[PDB]
Curated annotation (Swiss-Prot), chain B:
Component of a Wnt-signaling complex that contains a WNT protein, a FZD protein and LRP5 or LRP6. Interacts directly with LRP5 or LRP6; the interaction is promoted by Wnt-binding and signaling and inhibited by DKK1. Interacts with GPOC, RSPO1 and RSPO3. Interacts with glypican GPC3. Receptor for Wnt proteins. Component of the Wnt-Fzd-LRP5-LRP6 complex that triggers beta-catenin signaling through inducing aggregation of receptor-ligand complexes into ribosome-sized signalosomes. The beta-catenin canonical signaling pathway leads to the activation of disheveled proteins, inhibition of GSK-3 kinase, nuclear accumulation of beta-catenin and activation of Wnt target genes. Residues 1-118 form the FZ domain. It is found in: Membrane; Golgi apparatus; Cell membrane. It comes from the Eukaryota. Glycans are attached at residue 17. Most abundant in fetal kidney, followed by brain and lung. In adult tissues, expressed in kidney, heart, pancreas and skeletal muscle. The chain holds residues 33 to 150 of 694 of the full protein. Hexadecanoate binds at residues 39-46. Disulfide bonds join 3-64, 11-57, 48-86, 75-116, 79-103. This is Frizzled-8. The lineage of its organism: Eukaryota, Metazoa, Chordata, Craniata, Vertebrata. Belongs to the G-protein coupled receptor Fz/Smo family. Residues 63-68, 115-118 are annotated as: Wnt-binding. Ubiquitinated by ZNRF3, leading to its degradation by the proteasome.
Length: 89, 119
């Protein structure tokens, strides 16, 4: 019976791993590059529009970094849950 | 040299937080320098060169240090690497390497007489 817990424990640890999915940084770099490519073909190098787009991209980057920060707090929480759950066994 | 915190969004978090004005281009405020350097944002975000953002900012927002009261330009190698990466892409979109960004004007790395920033 106590050895069932350990089997359940790893399933919690396995599911806890999936919970902090993150992986946004790789996709974000492709998106910003796609906008930069469009910006280049549009001839941004009109001037006022180009400045606003870049300002939006930096806020989007902040949003992505913000989303990544909460994902780390999730990972901190899944660790603390594993800690107290281990205390009984 | 009067140091002022860098407010240009493109030049934040580049390795130093303080700059002085006017820059080599005779811009009197960061708002004036910011408006020009921000036009280069597609080349920075496309990442043609890892060294482009530092090189551009090191001129439009030159580094200011409380102990070293002297302009500290980027090493020529920084300029050359940024040109190697981004000049072909610029050329593909009809833009030549800007005359103000000529690398020959910058001091070479490792010279005992003049110091420069290289990373």
């Amino acid at each position: 019976a106590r050895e069932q817990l350990k089997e359940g424990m790893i399933k919690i640890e396995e599911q806890g791993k999936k919970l902090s999915e993150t992986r946004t940084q790789e996709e974000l770099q492709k998106y910003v590059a796609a906008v930069a490519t469009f910006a280049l073909q549009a001839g941004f190098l009109i001037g006022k529009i180009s400045g606003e787009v870049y300002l939006k991209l930096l806020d989007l980057k902040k949003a992505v970094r913000a989303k990544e920060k909460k994902g780390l707090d999730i990972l901190n929480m899944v660790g603390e849950i594993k800690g107290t759950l281990e205390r009984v066994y | 040299l009067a140091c002022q915190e860098i407010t240009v969004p493109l030049c934040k978090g580049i390795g130093y937080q303080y700059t002085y004005m006017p820059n080599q281009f005779n811009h009197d405020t960061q708002d004036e320098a910011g408006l020009e350097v921000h036009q280069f944002w597609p080349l920075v975000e496309i990442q043609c060169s890892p060294d482009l953002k530092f090189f551009l900012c090191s001129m439009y927002t030159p580094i200011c240090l409380e102990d070293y009261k002297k302009p500290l330009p980027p090493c020529r190698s920084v300029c050359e690497r940024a040109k190697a990466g981004c000049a072909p892409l610029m050329r593909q979109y009809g833009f030549a390497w800007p005359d103000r960004m000529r690398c020959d004007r910058l001091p070479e790395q490792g010279n005992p007489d003049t110091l420069c920033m290289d990373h």
